[PDB]
């Protein structure tokens, strides 16, 4: 597994600057290029 994918996903999942819509959008982005 892409350890890059896991790190970004984890960070986005815990980023306090993102609200649910923002997090979901960021995670979808990470997912799509993963």
């Amino acid at each position: 597994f892409n350890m890059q994918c896991q790190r970004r996903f984890y960070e986005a999942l815990h980023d306090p600057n993102l609200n649910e819509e923002q997090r979901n959008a960021k995670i979808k982005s990470i997912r799509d290029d993963c």
Binding site: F1, Q6, C34
Partner: protein, 208 residues
């Protein structure tokens, strides 16, 4: 009439963004002459229609089995979202409803501890390599073993057990040949959990 059982995603799927977690709804006891089954899905009340329903399968016992699968968002499960499956069948007074979510409670980081065989076991052709994982919450977890960058599949892990402090613990046992151990080979027990940084950790074990 027919019965329903709702299943949660595999721990590993909700943790890896590469994997695809799902909630599964299974309908049993569907009648031949009242076989029409319909599923309705809701995430925290909001109905969704992306579920995928599988072709019923006449059970060896002369009844039925229908399955629908709702793909879910890792974060949503991880964040406590509730999934409800509603099954409607003419043989029911009213539709059946089942709901599930991740156990409630503050996640607790699991501590991993590798332990070498017992001296007494060295008298054998095969020895046990132990990985104790304790103090984690919720109980959802995944444990594996590898060596020389390759997976080791000769292990069995116990189910999680409720400790006295509200956390869970478990043990994984990798059985290897004494020679492979005494030969200084290195083994690692990796753990995947929500409360682990990057949902991952490892702990090695070898001779000395």
């Amino acid at each position: 009439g027919p019965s329903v059982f709702l299943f949660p995603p595999k721990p590993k799927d909700t943790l890896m963004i590469s994997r695809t977690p799902e909630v599964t709804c299974v309908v049993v006891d569907v009648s031949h002459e009242d076989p029409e089954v319909k599923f309705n899905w809701y995430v925290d009340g909001v109905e969704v229609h992306n579920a995928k329903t599988k072709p019923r399968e006449e059970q060896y016992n002369s009844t039925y089995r229908v399955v629908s699968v709702l793909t879910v968002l890792h974060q949503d499960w991880l964040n406590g979202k509730e999934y409800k499956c509603k099954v409607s069948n003419k043989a029911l007074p009213a539709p059946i409803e089942k709901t599930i979510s991740k156990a409630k409670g503050q996640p607790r980081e699991p501590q991993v501890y590798t332990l070498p065989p017992s001296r007494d076991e060295l008298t054998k052709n095969q020895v046990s390599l132990t990985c104790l994982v304790k103090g984690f919450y919720p109980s959802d977890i995944a444990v594996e073993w590898e060596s020389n960058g390759q997976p080791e599949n000769n292990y069995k892990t116990t189910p999680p057990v409720l400790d006295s402090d509200g956390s869970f613990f478990l043990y994984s046992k990798l059985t290897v040949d004494k020679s492979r151990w005494q030969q200084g080979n290195v083994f690692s027990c990796s753990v995947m959990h929500e409360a682990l940084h990057n949902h991952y950790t490892q702990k090695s074990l070898s001779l000395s």
